[PDB]
Design a protein around this ligand. Structure first.
Ligand SMILES: *[C@@H](O)[C@H](C[C@@H]1CCNC1=O)NC(=O)[C@H](CC(C)C)NC(=O)OCC(C)(C)Sc1cccc(F)c1
Ligand SMILES: *[C@@H](O)[C@H](C[C@@H]1CCNC1=O)NC(=O)[C@H](CC(C)C)NC(=O)OCC(C)(C)Sc1cccc(F)c1
Lengths: 302, 302
């Protein structure tokens, strides 16, 4: 029996109209064109021989307005340039006529956002990822994908929350919010960097367990319960994130009739082992589906 | 270590411009607007009391040109109507100015296509699915999602291959190609229908095993080999599809240096059990990634 839950991404049509190609010499990457501002990663100014330890402040001074080439596949003239954190704020004389209503937001661990993978300013694919506790994402990025944007949608408004910058040794990816800060303690330098541990997202495992109950799979549900405070103490010693309930989780509890503390106890015993049984066709706990995903995809509640 | 493989969907911007709302009385659903033709499922004409066993031929005669209301969120006047198989071919006086270069194709088991989920003619989300051997898909569809389209992209040309029609008891979904034929032996009637067995896609499991080798995971690779003919005989008695090699699979074999017959032997032993080990973080064989997905996402080869 299929759960009805898939990795669902937002429609990308609004964001594809904001994708441009930015070249600052020998390096090309993607940029976000909103109004008269083009955002792009700041290592576009970096020559290939200084990626390991670049001085962006000196490089920015070395740049002029005619040093950035912006193209849409239309060529955009740069009338101003500035750097905020690990991002470049290039000003252009033409405002994007297809600029959507948008905000800039920071995404937190356990939350899901949609990614538009682009190369040479041309959208290539879309996928959804969950920001992991170590502030990395398990995405699909290759050379030239920097500048690809991550976004969430609340109505007609697109909340941009991620710009791809680098890939780690473990194969995961990290980037920067549109305030210039890289997620976690990461730096936009081509060096090996210490990566924090990854943890199971408790609020997403609880949602995934609720989805099984909404699909008739409730063998793991027992009348025993574990409080949030006790579970969070247990989570700290078992590579699980501390659980914080939300209204979305409460809706799932109300509809199913199963308490959160019942599932918290279940996660503790399911962590020790599924014992040859399966939940939604899996033998491991899944934290890649948010409570809002289960609310939306299965019950049509947004 | 993350494999670098995610469920990747095509950009949906081109298809979102072709999505319309079709209402033929008390039922509303989605339609595909290409040139002066609007395609939509034919049970839009069905009153709610006859969904179990509808006479579409009589219903079509009962309809007029003014019986179909087509709206884009612009209202489209219907200047002609026809029925092909399980699909309606409505002619409108206005051609879609954003019609992309497109073809109509039939997707085969094991192949992957992108789906644009729509409700009331408004795109809501996108996801990618693999057509299963029983000619069903493990999608995320709800009431009103009929008319959502499935498509593949070869360059700038969009090959439409799926229109959502119904959901089965197992939670999977099936639809019709744009020639009017429902995939498999399914009928667009609100009754329980016999569903064929589902099988592991051998060509996709081979691709998934190759992706592990491309990520350093090759503990399952042994010098022993199993021929395609012998594997296909084994596949017939173990719920596996018969393997047919492709050029894409050959590229993966050439790059890795591991023969297909080596992995066919591995699948036979991995089917008996992973024996406590994991491949790409999984204890079961995965057939939801095509050889082209591994070729594109990991090696950038399209
Ligand atoms: C976009 O310009 C590009 C995107 C990556 C290419 C491979 N996969 C990607 O997503 N980003 C870069 O080339 C980065 C340039 C830096 C920010 C100046 N670097 C990058 O993605 O990774 C560099 C490292 C982190 C791989 S350097 C490294 C070396 C040895 C061991 C190790 F763990 C890290
Ligand atoms: C679009 O109109 C809508 C989409 C589905 C609603 C629920 N999930 C969907 O994807 N499709 C329908 O309502 C179909 C109308 C038919 C084609 C006239 N029916 C449908 O999706 O399923 C009807 C069945 C197959 C559930 S009837 C049934 C009853 C008992 C047991 C059983 F296995 C099947």
């Amino acid at each position: 029996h299929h759960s009805g839950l898939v990795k669902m991404s937002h429609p990308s049509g609004d964001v594809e109209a904001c994708m441009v190609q930015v070249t600052c010499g020998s390096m090309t990457l993607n940029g976000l064109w909103l109004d008269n501002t083009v955002w792009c990663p700041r290592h576009v100014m970096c020559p290939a021989d200084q990626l390991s330890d670049p001085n962006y402040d000196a490089l920015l001074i070395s740049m002029t307005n005619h040093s950035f080439s912006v193209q849409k596949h239309a060529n955009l003239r740069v009338v101003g340039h500035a750097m905020q954190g690990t991002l470049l704020k290039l000003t252009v004389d033409v405002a994007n006529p297809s600029t959507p209503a948008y905000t800039f937001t920071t995404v937190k661990p356990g939350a899901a956002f949609s990614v538009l993978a682009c190369y040479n300013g041309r959208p290539t694919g879309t996928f959804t990822v969950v920001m992991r506790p170590n502030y990395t994402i398990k995405g699909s990025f290759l050379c030239g994908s920097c500048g690809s944007v991550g976004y969430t949608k609340e109505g007609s408004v697109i909340n941009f929350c991620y710009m791809h910058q680098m890939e780690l040794a473990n194969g995961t990816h990290t980037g920067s919010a549109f305030d210039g800060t890289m997620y976690g303690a990461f730096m936009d330098k081509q060096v090996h960097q210490v990566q924090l541990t990854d943890k199971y997202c408790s609020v997403n495992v609880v949602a995934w367990l609720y989805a099984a109950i909404l699909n008739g799979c409730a063998w793991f549900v027992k009348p025993n319960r574990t409080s949030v405070v006790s579970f969070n103490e247990w989570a700290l010693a078992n590579q699980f994130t501390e659980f914080v309930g939300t209204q979305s989780v409460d809706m799932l509890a109300v509809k199913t009739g199963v308490a959160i503390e019942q599932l918290l106890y279940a996660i503790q015993q399911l962590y020790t082992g599924f014992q040859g049984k399966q939940i939604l066709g899996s033998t491991m706990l899944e934290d890649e589906f948010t409570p809002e995903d289960v609310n939306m995809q299965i019950m049509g509640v947004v």
